[PDB]
Amino acid sequence: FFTRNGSVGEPIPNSVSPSDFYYAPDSTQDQKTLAPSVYFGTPSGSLVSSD
Amino acid sequence: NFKELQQDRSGVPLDIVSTRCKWPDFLKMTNEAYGDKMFFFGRREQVYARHFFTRNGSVGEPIPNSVSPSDFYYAPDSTQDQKTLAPSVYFGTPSGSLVSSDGQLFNRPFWLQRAQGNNNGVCWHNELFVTVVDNTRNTNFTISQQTNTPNPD
Amino acid sequence: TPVAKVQSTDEYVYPTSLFCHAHTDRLLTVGHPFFSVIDNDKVTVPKVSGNQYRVFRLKFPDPNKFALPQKDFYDPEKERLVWRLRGLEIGRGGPLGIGTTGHPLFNKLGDTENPNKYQQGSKDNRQNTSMDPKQTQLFIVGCEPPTGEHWDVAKPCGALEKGDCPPIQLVNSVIEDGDMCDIGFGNMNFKELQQDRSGVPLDIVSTRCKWPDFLKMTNEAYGDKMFFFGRREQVYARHFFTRNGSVGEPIPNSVSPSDFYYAPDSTQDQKTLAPSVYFGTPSGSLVSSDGQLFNRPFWLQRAQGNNNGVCWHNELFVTVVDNTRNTNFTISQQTNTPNPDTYDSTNFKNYLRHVEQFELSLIAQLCKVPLDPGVLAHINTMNPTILENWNLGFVPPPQQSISDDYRYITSSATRCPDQNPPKEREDPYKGLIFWEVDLTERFSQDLDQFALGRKFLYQAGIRTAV
Amino acid sequence: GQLFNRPFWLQRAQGNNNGVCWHNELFVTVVDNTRNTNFTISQQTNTPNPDTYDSTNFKNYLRHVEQFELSLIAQLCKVPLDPGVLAHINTMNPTILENWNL
Amino acid sequence: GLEIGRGGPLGIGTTGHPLFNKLGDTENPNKYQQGSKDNRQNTSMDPKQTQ
Amino acid sequence: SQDLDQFALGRKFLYQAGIRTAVT
Amino acid sequence: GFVPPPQQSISDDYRYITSSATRCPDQNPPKEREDPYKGLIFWEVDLTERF
């Protein structure tokens, strides 16, 4: 499960639907900027079987 | 209800952090007297725990100092490492395993011969509700755009 | 004199064609998954975990006091009635999901699945370690409470020194509501066998994990503890870990694979032997809706034992474990002030809550027992409380006696008349805790109107009258 | 995937001995690696009194407990020992006749 | 007819050697390793399942 | 013992062969 | 002239009744089927296997 790199096309809205509140990590010197929320999985076709 | 139960707004991923996750009330819809809410249904659910994590925050209920805390019982007060307990609010990261073509519910005709309740497929009011969840085709396609011009090398 | 050789209920219990439906409205319970929250004494939030036994004690209405319209099918001078369980459904309401348990201070030294180099030892090497337990589903139904087994501390035949290994004994007990199921660390008394209090996760560290004794429950003479059961259980070893502590039993200095002595004398780092006390973390893999025991009707045609589903005493015990809906929901509350614009970890109080949901539905058949001398003697030898509950035995031995009835009982010109002594003393299962369900006011003859009822009618053919 | 806790009815054996328990003996050979849970139990023997966890303190042990229960259904069979059956049994295993008589 | 009763709960137990003869992991090695006197390690495993 | 129905395997053997104990 | 009592007669027999940590030899009190000739010495002759 990976991320993408690039300019954000659509940023995360300022409101958090789980908590019903706005959120920002402005109290910390790390999280102040969001990481890219553009996720992608790598597929995997599992075991190939003769049956 | 993640909106009113988790004011942290950061306890579950973006698509559900502000939504309500509902499960179908099979017990109530089945025990309805006329049997109108559903007269046929199917389900295939599966999950395993992929990763096991903690929650960061102020502890809401401290672990009791008796045998209810397990290993954290016997206070490591003598040892500068383990004086303060790690958060005992664990959450697992879910994972729906391998999607297969064999396990597919959809793209098959169903014949409603005998319904579950007393309503045997009568579409009262000229109306019918079909409820579908299919988490086996949930692949999100990554798009890109070359906004700053296709010119540079 | 009377009889030997326990006979089937099908020989002295005559069925009728009268079937009744009875069900619970919906049984919900909300609690904490690991430990009960108290203030200091009174329980504020109980322990509700998805790895507990749910032992429902179902109470039936006495069929001998049912006002049937024409009672001419049975004689209350020579006959008595009983309920026989014929259909059942154990409904389960929550979504499928796996919850995890852990200990903030677990006795785990290292990971010995693959060690990049040899290791060390100090004081308090405990770690915060969580795990998903073994997956277990079971259902037992009977007219007596289930028997569970676990390994416990016994008294040795001589004295030992301080820190010696406690001797094991297999201890049978009743399984109660809120007892813990086995989770992959065995069936053992963690409170007595592990004085560390850090050897297993928080929800079991002080509990007794019990397993149903199927070997004793099938091999009992009358077959009353269970007359039907289903079970599914799955586990694999997820990680492979080591204990920390003083090694109670050393490894023997002789190596039986090579027939030689061995010591790491040539290698300075390996001279002190690393702990050979290993443990795996269990893991109940992928849960599936295909593998589900519950939300299915079960028709009890032929019981396992000689009790063919007869609910003696108007009682039924339904014992459920469902480790397939053990999703613990993580709650959070914003304390102090609902005004900050920046996230702080001190601003939020994290909580855990587990919610279970059950719905129980049964089809009971009325049966008549004609109480002839040999049937009476056999029922009395099997269980005296049956012939006490049903008015017939204990014909009245003494005669009348004067009690002299002193007119002014609270005067000082006579002796003290105090007597009035007895509090009611009936319940023999009072020391045990069950999820008591009352179905006395829930019996109905209109099977067509209920989901299990019409499932029973469809299975038996028997369509409703038009 | 369990093999155990199930009745197995010996209708016909694999070989020429159709379930006959010669010499009044039966061998039952079981391996069961699906119940190999080692119960890790510790004792506080060097630690009565302390309210702070120490490692020197607790003595760790390992234990394992097996439980078996074997049930069988035997049938009585009779063998009429003529010259041909006696010589055939003597050829198969002399100990059978030496244990009986004849 | 015969039946073999089995009483304990299901479960997998692990075993190991405190001084097991392993030099290195060869499933995925990042680069070349080394070696000396007494390279033994504490290593546990779950055995083959057999009934 | 010859009283087969008294034991779990013995009544399983009886159920398998039909062979039910005579009702007294 | 005796029925089975409603309690049952399942005996718990340990395989190593001399070992430490199993409580007792379990059978001190001679309650059931003791002849009153316990106090008298006779030349006890067993003819059970001699008929």
Numbering used by the authors:
A (entry chain D): 256 to 306
B (entry chain C): 205 to 357
C (entry chain B): 17 to 482
D (entry chain F): 307 to 408
E (entry chain F): 103 to 153
F (entry chain F): 460 to 483
G (entry chain A): 409 to 459
Paste lines from the article.
Papillomavirus is a T = 7d icosahedral, double stranded DNA virus with a genome of ~8 kb. The capsid is composed of 72 capsomers, each containing five copies of L1, the major capsid protein. For each copy of L1 a loop of the C-terminus forms a connecting arm by extending to a neighboring capsomer, forming a stabilizing disulfide bond, and returning to the donating capsomer. The secondary structure of L1 proteins take the form of the ubiquitous β-jellyroll made up of eight anti-parallel β-strands (BIDG and CHEF) with loop regions that extend outward from the surface of the capsid and constitute the majority of the L1 hypervariable regions.
Here, we purified a native mouse papillomavirus (MmuPV1), for which we have used ISECC to obtain high resolution maps and made a comparison for the first time between native papillomavirus and lab generated capsids. The subparticle refinements were recombined into an icosahedral capsid with 3.3 Å resolution overall (ISECC_Recombine), a dramatic improvement over the original 4.4 Å map. The high resolution of the recombined map allowed for the full asymmetric unit of MmuPV1 to be built for the first time. The L1 protein structure was reliably visualized from Thr16–Ala481. The build of the L1 protein revealed the typical papillomavirus secondary structure elements of BIDG and CHEF anti-parallel beta strands making up the L1 core within each capsomer. Despite the sequence deviation between HPV and MmuPV1 (53% identity) there is structural conservation of the secondary, tertiary, and quaternary structures. Each copy of L1 has a C-terminal loop region spanning Trp 406–Trp 451 and five of these connecting arms extend from each capsomer, independent of whether the capsomer is in the hexavalent or pentavalent icosahedral environment. Each of these loop regions extends to interact with a neighboring capsomer and these interactions are stabilized by a disulfide bond between Cys 432 of the connecting arm and Cys 173 of the neighboring capsomer. Despite each copy of L1 being chemically identical, there are six unique disulfide bonds that occur, one per L1 chain comprising the asymmetric unit. The resolution of the map density for the connecting arms ranged from 3.3–3.8 Å with some spots of weak density suggesting that the connecting arms are flexible.
